[PDB]
Ligand binder design. Sequence first.
Ligand SMILES: OC[C@@H](O)[C@@H](O)[C@@H](O)[C@@H](O)CO
Ligand SMILES: [Cl-]
Length: 294
Amino acid sequence: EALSLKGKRIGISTAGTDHFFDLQAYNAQIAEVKRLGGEPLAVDAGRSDGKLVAQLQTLIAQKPDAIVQLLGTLTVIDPWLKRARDAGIPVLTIDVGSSHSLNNSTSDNWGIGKDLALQLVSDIGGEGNVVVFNGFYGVTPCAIRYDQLVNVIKYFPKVKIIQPELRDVIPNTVQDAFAQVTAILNKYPEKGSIKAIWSAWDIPQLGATQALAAAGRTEIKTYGVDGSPEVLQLVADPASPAAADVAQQPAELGRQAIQNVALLLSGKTLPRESYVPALLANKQTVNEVTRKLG
Ligand SMILES: OC[C@@H](O)[C@@H](O)[C@@H](O)[C@@H](O)CO
Ligand SMILES: [Cl-]
């Protein structure tokens, strides 16, 4: 029969909503629970680990029909996802590869990370130095994306990751990424001594790209993931060093998660992960990518 959540209460917990991917996935879950007739209990951690734990505890005390957790550092949330299951509460996730989740809605990040890395390598001629932002390695999709970069360049050994990897941050992501790249360009002033800057998601990319323009170092190419509109439009600008951004579908991911909650409560067994396609946008493909998202 048609899916429904009538009479159900669904806990919806996100690590934050402070940029495109997170806001989209969060809102679309809330929307979808409502559209299926369920009652969402939606809690935003504002990117505090303390608030994230505290709101999951409260959702647990509420004994909703399911909890969906969006993003977060796996070691931070895992004890609470376990507690929820132990309390009798079905747990699903978005971008969290937990043993305690019944189903993780996520892009196929092996595909994403490999595709981005191969683009990067091809773009720089198989040779040169790469500045890497790797500040969210504790977050499943970012860990996978980083692992794939490492693994792709392993087989193109004239490609090197510059040492001290940088740590991107949230919030203040753009201003911080701008400052870090600005300071690193001053360590490596010689044209050609950096060829790319990689990030696991595209808001640090945005900071990076800006710092390149400001510094007069646009020979350097930038790379990222999410397809936030503000960054896609940089990729589309020939005069921008933003070279590639793998677009994700966060509203689709959020709807899928809730679709999968309904399926679970109706009795069906879920696959452990459910992959939503992603689309690599480079300077040639961004138009057809941007159009498929709008
Ligand atoms: O954990 C940071 C970041 O990767 C996420 O907030 C989001 O932007 C997506 O890239 C996750 O699929
Ligand atoms: Cl320039």
